[PDB]
């Protein structure tokens, strides 16, 4: 009985530790997403709503599924009420509820870990917020950074030490890229995007090659 959940938990943990990593952090302009991903067709980072961003690690088909559900959920709430009533906390709670049910009722738990990032409105002085939801429905709020996928401990501590508030875009990218190197590679072959608070409505924006070139520090 208690052993069932024991095993289910291990299957998920191992599957996630077997995959690559992702780093999400708070800086001067809003939120930065730095994920290890060799592909440019299949993503691990995505826009959720006006001021919400999504990032995940684990089994693709499973978090891609949760990514879509999130977009559906956000678009719908915005329509039933007002776009501004769509909150990051609301989506985070929904993912927690969903993953929790899957971990208990489904044939196999989802080998996934998810992060929801929210930035304030154009004017608002509100500091960005991050939420992390795990395969068993656990959820925590982080106000500085989140690390998930593969062997996190080394990458986490690195970040824990190289993190500073109000970081420059170039600095923030460096902080993440170097922390990613403390794991185990790590060239301009990764997925990057930001939740730019300066933007009027849709804050999500991806950072392409040429622009990424001048941000990723050499080793």
């Amino acid at each position: 009985a208690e052993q069932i959940m024991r095993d289910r938990s291990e299957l998920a943990r191992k599957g996630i530790a077997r995959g690559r990593s992702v780093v999400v952090l708070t800086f001067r302009d809003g939120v930065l997403f730095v994920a290890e991903n060799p592909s440019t067709a299949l993503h691990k980072v995505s826009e959720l709503y006006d001021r919400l961003g999504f990032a995940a690690v684990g089994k693709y088909n499973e978090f891609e599924n949760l990514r879509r559900a999130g977009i559906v959920h956000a678009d719908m709430r915005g329509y039933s009420y007002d776009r501004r009533d769509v909150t990051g906390r609301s989506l985070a709670n929904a993912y927690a509820q969903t993953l929790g049910t899957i971990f208990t009722e489904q044939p196999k738990p989802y080998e996934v870990e998810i992060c929801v990032a929210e930035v304030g409105r154009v004017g608002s002085p509100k500091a960005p917020q991050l939420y992390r939801i795990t395969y068993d429905g656990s959820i925590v709020d982080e106000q500085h950074f989140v690390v998930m996928g593969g062997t996190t401990e080394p990458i986490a501590t690195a970040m824990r030490e190289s993190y500073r508030a109000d970081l420059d875009l170039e600095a923030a990218v460096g902080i993440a890229v170097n922390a990613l190197r403390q794991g185990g590679v790590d060239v301009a072959s990764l997925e990057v995007a930001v939740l730019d608070q300066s933007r009027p409505r849709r804050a999500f924006r991806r950072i392409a090659g040429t622009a990424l070139e001048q941000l990723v520090p050499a080793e």
């Binding site: 039933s80 009420y81 007002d82 501004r84 009533d85 909150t87 906390r89 609301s90």
Partner: protein
């Protein structure tokens, strides 16, 4: 019935008459047609009292339920969209004669110009919602008269006291030309009711202030 909504410096207000008729017969003398729907919003309703009063009641519950579940109140626009949804859900009954139409007002906490955070939203029988922004608006059988009176006596960005007076007056003019509205009853001491919403929230105007305002309009008119 006549319900009026007015915008002013501080915020917004709603005022409504107290009459209910069944054809030509008078069925009620103390109907409450204006309700505080939450801290910063209120709504007035015209139409089948049976449905209307419980509908605005459910609306209030729904707004507070949202806040307790989400820990955050809805946007004013979000509150308006919800009311629309409820009106839309009554289209069936409306097509059988049991129609109801609300008038929504509120102090928009997310408004830029804090002196113009007061808002007025009118509705359709099909669920449509409309921003008024003319300073005032009205609904009900006597609305036509109230609006034409306001078109002359209303002053934009006036103070609360001035707005409240213009409101009771427009309602007076409405009862003067529409037997279905009914003016101040100095005989039983029953007067229109009102709610004012400002930076401090939605408050019920005391019946002493309504009484006073009524007596005044009556005296100004009695004075030929």
């Amino acid at each position: 019935t006549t319900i009026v909504a007015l915008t002013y410096k501080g915020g917004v207000l709603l005022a409504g008459d107290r009459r209910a008729t069944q054809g030509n017969l008078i069925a009620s003398r103390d109907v409450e047609k204006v309700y505080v729907t939450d801290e910063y919003s209120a709504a007035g309703i015209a139409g089948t009292a049976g449905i209307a009063i419980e509908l605005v009641r459910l609306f209030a519950v729904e707004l507070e339920h949202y806040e307790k579940i989400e820990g955050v109140p809805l946007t004013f626009d979000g509150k308006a969209n919800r009311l629309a949804s409820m009106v839309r859900g009554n289209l069936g009954a409306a097509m059988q004669g049991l129609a109801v139409v609300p008038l929504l007002v509120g102090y928009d906490l997310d408004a830029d110009d804090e002196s113009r955070a007061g808002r007025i939203v009118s509705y359709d029988v099909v669920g449509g919602r409309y921003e008024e922004r003319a300073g005032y608006h009205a609904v009900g059988s006597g609305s036509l008269f109230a609006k034409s009176a306001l078109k002359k006596i209303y002053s934009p960005d006036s103070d609360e006291e001035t707005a409240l007076r213009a409101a009771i007056e427009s309602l007076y003019d409405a009862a003067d030309d529409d037997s279905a509205t009914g003016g101040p009853d100095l005989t039983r001491g029953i007067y229109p009711t009102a709610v004012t919403i400002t930076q401090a929230g939605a408050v019920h105007v005391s019946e002493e202030t309504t009484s006073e305002l009524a007596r005044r309009i009556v005296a100004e008119r009695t004075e030929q």
